[PDB]
Amino acid sequence: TTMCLLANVTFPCAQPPICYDRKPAETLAMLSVNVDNPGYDELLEAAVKC
Amino acid sequence: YKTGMDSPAIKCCGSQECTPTYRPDEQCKVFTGVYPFMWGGAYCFCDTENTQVSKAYVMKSDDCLADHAEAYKAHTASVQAFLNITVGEHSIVTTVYV
Amino acid sequence: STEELFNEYKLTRPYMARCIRCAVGSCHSPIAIEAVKSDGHDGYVRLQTSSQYGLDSSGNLKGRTMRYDMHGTIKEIPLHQVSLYTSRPCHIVDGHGYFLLARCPAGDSITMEFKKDSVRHSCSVPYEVKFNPVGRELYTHPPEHGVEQACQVYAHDAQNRGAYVEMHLPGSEVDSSLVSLSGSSVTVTPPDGTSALVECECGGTKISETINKTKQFSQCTKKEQCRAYRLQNDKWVYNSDKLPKAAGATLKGKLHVPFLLADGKCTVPLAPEPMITFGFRSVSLKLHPKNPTYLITRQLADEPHYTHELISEPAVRN
Amino acid sequence: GAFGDIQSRTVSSSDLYANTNLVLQRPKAGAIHVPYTQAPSGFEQWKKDKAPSLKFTAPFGCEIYTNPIRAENCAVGSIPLAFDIPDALFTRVSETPT
Amino acid sequence: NECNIPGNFMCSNGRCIPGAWQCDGLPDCFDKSDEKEC
Numbered sequence: 292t293t294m295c296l297l298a299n300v301t302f303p304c305a306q307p308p309i310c311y312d313r314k315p316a317e318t319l320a321m322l323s324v325n326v327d328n329p330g331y332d333e334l335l336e337a338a339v340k341c
Numbered sequence: 342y343k344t345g346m347d348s349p350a351i352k353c354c355g356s357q358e359c360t361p362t363y364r365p366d367e368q369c370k371v372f373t374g375v376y377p378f379m380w381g382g383a384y385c386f387c388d389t390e391n392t393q394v395s396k397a398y399v400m401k402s403d404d405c406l407a408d409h410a411e412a413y414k415a416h417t418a419s420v421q422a423f424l425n426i427t428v429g430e431h432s433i434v435t436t437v438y439v
Numbered sequence: 440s441t442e443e444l445f446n447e448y449k450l451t452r453p454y455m456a457r458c459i460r461c462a463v464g465s466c467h468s469p470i471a472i473e474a475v476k477s478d479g480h481d482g483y484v485r486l487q488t489s490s491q492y493g494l495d496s497s498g499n500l501k502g503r504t505m506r507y508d509m510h511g512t513i514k515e516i517p518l519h520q521v522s523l524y525t526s527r528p529c530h531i532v533d534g535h536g537y538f539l540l541a542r543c544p545a546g547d548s549i550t551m552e553f554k555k556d557s558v559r560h561s562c563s564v565p566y567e568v569k570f571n572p573v574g575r576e577l578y579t580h581p582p583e584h585g586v587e588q589a590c591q592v593y594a595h596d597a598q599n600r601g602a603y604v605e606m607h608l609p610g611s612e613v614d615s616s617l618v619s620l621s622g623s624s625v626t627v628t629p630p631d632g633t634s635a636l637v638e639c640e641c642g643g644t645k646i647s648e649t650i651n652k653t654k655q656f657s658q659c660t661k662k663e664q665c666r667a668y669r670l671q672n673d674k675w676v677y678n679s680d681k682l683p684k685a686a687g688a689t690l691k692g693k694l695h696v697p698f699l700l701a702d703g704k705c706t707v708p709l710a711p712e713p714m715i716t717f718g719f720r721s722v723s724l725k726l727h728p729k730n731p732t733y734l735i736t737r738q739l740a741d742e743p744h745y746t747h748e749l750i751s752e753p754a755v756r757n
Numbered sequence: 758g759a760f761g762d763i764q765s766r767t768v769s770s771s772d773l774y775a776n777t778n779l780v781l782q783r784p785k786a787g788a789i790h791v792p793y794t795q796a797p798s799g800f801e802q803w804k805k806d807k808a809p810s811l812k813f814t815a816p817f818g819c820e821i822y823t824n825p826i827r828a829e830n831c832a833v834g835s836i837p838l839a840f841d842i843p844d845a846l847f848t849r850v851s852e853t854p855t
Numbered sequence: 856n857e858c859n860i861p862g863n864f865m866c867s868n869g870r871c872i873p874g875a876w877q878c879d880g881l882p883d884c885f886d887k888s889d890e891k892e893c
């Protein structure tokens with residue numbers, strides 16, 4: 292399993308707290324810090340859709 | 342290969358520095374005396390003492406997976422035959438190792 | 440499931456970059472060209488441009504469109520207005536994100552152009568485009584009939600595979616349609632829903648970030664001394680060398696690239712059958728190639744004495 | 758400029774050696790770009806030259822294949838054989854025609 | 856069946872159109888077989 296990061300909150304990468312159709316730049320900042328991640332594609336395709 | 346290039350760091354009436362990243366063949370150089378233009382006019386107001394940093398590195402191409410060449414070393418081969426033996430009208434077909 | 444594919448270039452915007460050959464001279468073009476890759480076989484190239492494809496002017500999905508950046512305001516046209524050519528005209532197949540797929544002939548340049556009302560846009564780049572045949576018969580246009588070798592062409596769908604490019608903060612795109620004169624001073628008018636910042640040199644060292652306000656400044660007489668930048672915290676760009684960058688770690692994510700080089704099947708020609716004359720320990724070969732054809736011979740002994748020859752004329756080999 | 762100017766240890770090694778003669782150049786006065794000058798792809802230059810495969814040049818008429826690297830049907834040498842035959846197979850004389 | 860090029864969708868007549876043209880709201884294959892089951 293793989294846990295992603297926005298703060299010290301290790302949320303599951305398939306279940307993000309935010310989506311781009313709600314927030315313009317907070318999703319991009321969440322993707323900013325999590326580039327070095329093997330589950331980045333999971334966080335990616337989950338972080339688009341609600 | 343695929344020469345990747347970072348965007349030029351521009352400071353107006355300043356001076357940049359070279360911060361390396363240890364990327365493969367990562368060249369970096371700081372250029373002084375630069376008056377750059379954007380589409381919406383000039384970028385600085387200073388004539389001289391401006392600074393642009395070029396940074397380039399080599400990464401491998403996007404089609405590396407399906408289009409690549411494997412360099413090997415070979416030694417001490419192994420011979421292996423598909424015989425079809427019949428001894429007294431009793432036939433087998435067996436991969437024998439020789 | 441195309442909407443799952445298109446949803447990552449929704450985070451991005453088209454931009455303008457420097458093209459060296461425009462319709463008249465050297466300009467800043469909305470259709471600038473970053474790279475041309477031509478390593479698939481039967482004439483398919485993959486352009487990475489400074490425009491975006493498959494999305495509308497908002498961010499939603501329209502089918503066959505080019506989305507570009509015209510001095511900040513994002514515009515759009517249908518895809519059948521855009522044409523490109525190397526030596527002969529090329530044929531645009533599809534587009535996805537910053538990437539375009541065309542069926543091109545061989546040539547030493549790429550030129551993409553579209554036509555607006557009375558403004559013609561163009562961008563020529565000195566990027567070599569080659570044509571790669573399959574097999575031992577060197578054609579220039581793919582045939583009508585033959586046999587089928589395996590090949591490697593750029594795939595036509597936008598399927599997510601394991602190859603990425605790197606996206607970043609757009610930097611401070613400076614403007615000068617913002618700054619204007621008052622009757623006695625300098626006036627900066629940032630656009631609505633967008634924050635500008637102003638650097639001047641008319642007092643000592645002056646600097647400000649302003650929001651949504653026609654904000655004048657005293658002690659500045661001429662508007663040559665003030666540069667009004669523009670800011671967009673959202674809306675990624677590509678890591679281009681034709682753009683300036685932001686301040687501090689710069690990185691915001693990575694996107695997949697469409698149309699990768701996949702294994703396929705390609706039709707190759709079949710040369711006219713050689714006319715073989717036999718003799719005592721000797722074989723004569725009459726050869727009439729239609730287009731240039733490799734003849735490769737070897738002997739089945741401890742010294743092969745292999746012969747390798749491109750033959751493009753009617754020839755007799757003994 | 759030749760074969761192996763990129764050397765990735767495996768396909769997904771994420772640590773590649775690169776010696777591609779990259780040299781950064783000074784940008785043109787009034788333009789934001791990163792100008793470089795490097796030797797061309799040695800893999801492409803290897804593909805342009807490419808003395809023909811071992812499929813066409815191998816002695817004794819071998820048939821080189823790919824997914825296991827192997828040769829086929831090389832008409833060279835000779836296979837010796839050992840037969841350990843049990844005594845039950847030896848039929849007597851008068852149970853066969855003569 | 857399957858096209859020779861991997862990114863292509865095969866229509867009713869065997870015409871291979873790109874795979875991003877299937878279920879797009881625009882008819883490209885004869886008798887709209889790109890617009891049958893969406």
Ligand SMILES: [Ca+2]
Nearest residue numbers: 876881883889
């Ligand atoms: Ca359709």
